[PDB]
Amino acid sequence: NLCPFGEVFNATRFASVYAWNRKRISNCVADYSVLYNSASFSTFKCYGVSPTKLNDLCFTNVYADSFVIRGDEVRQIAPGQTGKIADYNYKLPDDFTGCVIAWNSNNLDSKVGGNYNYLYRLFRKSNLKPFERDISTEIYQAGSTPCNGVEGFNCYFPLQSYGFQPTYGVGYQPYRVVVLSFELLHAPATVCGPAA
Amino acid sequence: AERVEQTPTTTTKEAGESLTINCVLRDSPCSLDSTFWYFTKKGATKKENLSNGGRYAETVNKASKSFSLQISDLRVEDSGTYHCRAYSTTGDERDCRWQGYIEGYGTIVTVKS
Ligand SMILES: *[C@@H]1O[C@H](CO[C@@H]2O[C@@H](C)[C@@H](O)[C@@H](O)[C@@H]2O)[C@@H](O[C@@H]2O[C@H](CO)[C@@H](O)[C@H](O)[C@H]2NC(C)=O)[C@H](O)[C@H]1NC(C)=O
Fold first, then answer.
1. Which domain holds residue B79?
2. Where is this region: Immunodominant HLA epitope recognized by the CD8+ (chain A)?
């Protein structure tokens, strides 16, 4: 009986990248090949495994992480990358084993006035650890003078809205992303492709 | 940096003309192992596969990591978004860490008259 990837890929609304969602997949069968062969994705990049082998393999756990970023940020969803998404929003570990899958969602996630519901973190005192999640909204102290929870000179609200509008250049359009991590831990391996 | 650059982003033509679209894999440690093109009809969201054949000619230069589509004898019904897809599948150039594909941002084609 088949993995609920449908609940992740086809959710009506995705998370903001700073508040990225994660579904723990277990005890099921997954046709990775129909995903990989689908014309609907613009990015399908597997690290430490071949996409055409996934139907043949089993894992302890698959994590399906999901969020929205702008098209020109999709390259930052990769091991060893730098920039505001990789540093402050969603960070993959150096030894990542998984696939990064993205598609243009301009038709779903942009709005005539601007969609203010998708944000990213623009400032943080340190880089995230791999798979760390920060949903805090404290004013960021950029300078020496104290903010006291008030936006002001060198005192910034740390989240910025993408404000996606349908008329934006395709690099500024919203992309839906799903990261599949394939985890192999001391347990026996319940999450299988059909051919395993 | 690592991207498929697709030119032109937009064109207008008259029917009976032809059009070339050029894609190059820039700033990548990965080899171009295989290429694919898709068409979204103006007003549809389904991506149609485009084969090498008929009014469609598909070429690849692996060494410069470029690939093109030439459409011959353009019709009004050719109007829409064209996407190119670059596959890196050997993932055995030393610094290339991924296997799979990346696409350009597309070409919006308007065919008139
Ligand atoms: C996510 O959704 C697509 C699209 O599905 C159809 O249209 C939706 C709006 C809704 O009406 C769905 O219930 C429909 O199924 C899925 O693609 C379809 O997959 C089925 C196999 O179950 C297949 O028969 C159809 O050919 C596909 N339809 C299209 C339009 O491609 C897709 O599989 C879903 N993704 C995941 C990972 O579950």
1. 1-113
2. 115-123
